[PDB]
């Protein structure tokens, strides 16, 4: 499955230049919005947008290009066509078979922050790691009922390696007898993963 | 800007002076690949991805050429308005739960990078360390600065204090995020 790219148009006749083509998918490929952006020193100065249907100058700098690119049929049709030839094509082919199908199970490990003393305050940390995609539910329990008080999760941590991490802390007081359970739901999981820690 | 998914199917970046270019695909925040401009090959982040999908590196090389051109054109057209340095920001966190004696990965996420020229190096107890060091490509941000992640394989000891050392033009002196 071969990926296609957006094609930068040629500007008309420390510095940083950036070109990109973005494909905004909603409900799979039922709705696709396609935007092309040209950026000079962090200022977008021209763009294509499948909603407008042509290049529009975003600033004074973009005037020359927008008007020219729009005036060459070979060019305009080439950029417009990318909504299908880049976005739809990449989504239905390469994407559907890679990122769109990636399913990494979370690792769940409970952990005790300070050396355990019964009848003393301490804090459990439920590390939920190495998972994909991002949608995930993590809940604590003490003897079977949900905890909401003294509970705190980090935001979703993006690892940069196509996996995610979330840490869920629970402030608690371990009594002799009680069982703490960390409960996680993720789409790569046939049934929820529970891990227990007995006081 | 609402959407379920967003692929950035071609990001081209070019800097002058120094002839620095970068070309990548991203999807929902993650790098599908960069094209090595010297080797001229497409390098997938996940190997198993490169087994299912492909990309002609030329597709990226040409884009770079265009973008190298446009940059020149836009440099004159602006009358040589140069880029403004930003101060980047770093955060260190381990990839897995830290257990002493077990090999892990420390991760340095540096953000608000602009321009995208940065030195990210690891220190352990103040001495340079480079164990299995991996660096990501510059990821794009909504405001057109970049972020980037470095990696370090290490064994967690209580006799060790790690720093992530970050060098940038927007920083009067190097900043180190302790951990």
């Amino acid at each position, epitope marked *: 499955f071969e990926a*296609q790219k957006a*094609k930068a148009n*040629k500007a008309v006749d420390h510095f940083v230049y950036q070109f990109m083509g973005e494909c905004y998918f909603t409900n799979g490929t039922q709705r696709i919005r396609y935007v092309t952006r040209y950026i000079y020193n962090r200022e977008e100065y021209v763009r294509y947008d499948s909603d407008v249907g042509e290049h529009r100058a975003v600033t004074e700098l973009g005037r020359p290009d927008a008007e020219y690119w729009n005036s060459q049929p*070979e060019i305009l049709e080439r950029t417009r066509a990318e909504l299908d*030839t880049v976005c739809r094509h990449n989504y239905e082919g390469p994407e559907t078979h890679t990122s769109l199908r990636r399913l990494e199970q979370p690792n769940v490990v409970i952990s005790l922050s300070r050396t355990e003393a019964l009848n003393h305050h301490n804090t459990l940390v439920c590390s939920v790691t190495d998972f994909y995609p991002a949608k995930i539910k993590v809940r604590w329990f003490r003897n079977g009922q949900e905890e909401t008080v003294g509970v705190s999760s980090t935001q979703l941590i993006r690892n940069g390696d196509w996996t995610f991490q979330v840490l869920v802390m629970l402030e608690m007081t371990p009594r002799r007898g009680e069982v703490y359970t960390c409960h996680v739901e993720h789409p790569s999981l046939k049934s929820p993963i529970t891990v227990e820690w007995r006081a | 800007i609402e959407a379920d998914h967003v692929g950035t199917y071609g990001i081209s970046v070019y800097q002058s002076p120094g002839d620095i270019g970068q070309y990548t695909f991203e999807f929902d925040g993650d790098e599908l690949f960069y094209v090595d401009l010297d080797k001229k090959e497409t390098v997938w982040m996940l190997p198993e991805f490169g087994q299912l999908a492909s990309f002609d590196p*030329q597709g990226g*090389l*040409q884009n770079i*050429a*265009v973008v190298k051109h446009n940059l020149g054109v836009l440099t004159k057209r602006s009358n040589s308005t140069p880029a403004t340095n930003e101060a980047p920001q770093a955060t260190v966190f381990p990839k897995s739960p830290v257990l002493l004696g077990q090999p892990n990965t420390l991760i340095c996420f540096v953000d608000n990078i602009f321009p995208p020229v940065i030195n990210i190096t690891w220190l352990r107890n103040s001495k340079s360390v480079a164990d299995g060091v991996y660096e990501t490509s510059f990821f794009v941000n909504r405001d057109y600065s970049f972020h980037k992640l470095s990696y370090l394989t290490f064994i967690p000891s209580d006799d060790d204090i790690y720093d992530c050392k970050v060098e940038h033009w927007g920083l009067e002196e190097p900043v180190l995020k302790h951990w």
Partner: T-cell receptor
Amino acid sequence: QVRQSPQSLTVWEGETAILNCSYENSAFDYFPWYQQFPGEGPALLIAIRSVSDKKEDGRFTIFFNKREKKLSLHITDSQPGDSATYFCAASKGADRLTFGKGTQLIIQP
Amino acid sequence: AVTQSPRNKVAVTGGKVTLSCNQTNNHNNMYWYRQDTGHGLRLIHYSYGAGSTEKGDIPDGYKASRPSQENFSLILELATPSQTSVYFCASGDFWGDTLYFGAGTRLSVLE
């Protein structure tokens, strides 16, 4: 790989010359034909995009079949001045072309 | 326009042969082809702009140089009989629907 048939083809003047082309890579989306007269370099004659199954331009038309990845240039009411070599090429997302080996066209008066 | 020089050449085996090509079309891309019966047009090297080049399908035995937006040169470092051919230079725009060829260069490498 782009494959043309035949190597050479003689046709009575006024008849419709048919030059065949065929390709292997399904991703190809752009198919231009080049016309080369003796002593000269080749020159774009007529071209088609896989989005379309036909392109007409006077006496020249291209018939395109995406399923069979087969492709055909028709020259109608052919003239001695149509004598030449005709190349079939292909492209993927606007990258460099790959040419077929070409077909020699000899029109008989 | 695309003009190749020289238009005819006789070289000896082991000699050096540079075929240059100037292009007046303000085009960014230039390509170097060869043509031999039973092989049609075969890309040898091309280039997206000054200072850089890219291997075609049959780069072996040929060097290439783009010192200019105007000029693209093909270098035969050690000329061999196998390189006996008619050579065509071409130019186009970025992503161009349309290649523009020069007139041709007949080269004979003789033993």
